[PDB]
Write the structure tokens for this entry.
Amino acid sequence: PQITLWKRPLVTIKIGGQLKEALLDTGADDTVLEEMNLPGRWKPKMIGGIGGFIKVRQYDQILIEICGHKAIGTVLVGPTPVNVIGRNLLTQIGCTLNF
Amino acid sequence: PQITLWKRPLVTIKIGGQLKEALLDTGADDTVLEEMNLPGRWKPKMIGGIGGFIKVRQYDQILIEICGHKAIGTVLVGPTPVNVIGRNLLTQIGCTLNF
Ligand SMILES: CC(C)CN(C[C@@H](O)[C@H](Cc1ccccc1)NC(=O)O[C@H]1CO[C@H]2OCC[C@H]21)S(=O)(=O)c1ccc2c(c1)CC[C@@H]2O
């Protein structure tokens, strides 16, 4: 579909058998999601943006479905105020910016 | 243009007569630029990001050209890690997400 940007580009995603709401975020290199106790191994990471850094858990090869488009890649889990789908997964669902 | 997301969506902007590089950021409500000199009045403002809140200088009705497309709108100036173009200006240049 086509998503205008008058409001935040929020979509439903399916991850870890749970449905959540996330932003389609061209400004995020990678995907960052709210605290969720996913199974499997992970490695610690620090990610920075406006206001500073947060500590997150990096999970690899995670399956996510975004508006019915399946993707698989890195998901960073931590105390983020918003869930963002970043370019690592947006490329996989074929998402472009257009103007 | 149609912009894929294998790389950061970086573009050249013109603001205050100076060229700069900025990131097209659909996950940003607002446009935030790194410290710079801009003419005119400004009001102290706070904005929150992934890591917390920062103090910015808010400039209203600022001419800014983004990849050859003109906008006039609010530009926040402050200690952001990256020059980001947010939805307040992406809508002005007609930017949509498409997949
Ligand atoms: C600033 C960008 C360059 C990087 N961010 C992504 C932007 O889209 C953030 C997303 C966001 C939205 C809502 C709340 C919190 C965050 N928007 C943002 O800060 O918006 C400002 C300005 O407008 C306001 O409206 C929203 C908030 C205000 S990030 O979240 O910091 C990030 C993500 C992944 C990753 C990193 C860093 C590092 C490595 C990893 O890839």
Notes: Residues 42 and 59 of chain B are 5 Å apart (CA to CA). The pocket of YUJ is lined by residues A 25, 27-30, 32, 47-50, 81-82, 84, 86; B 23, 25, 27-30, 32, 47-50, 82, 84, 86 (CB under 6 Å). The longest helix of chain B spans residues 87-90. The first strand of chain B starts at residue 2 and ends at 3.
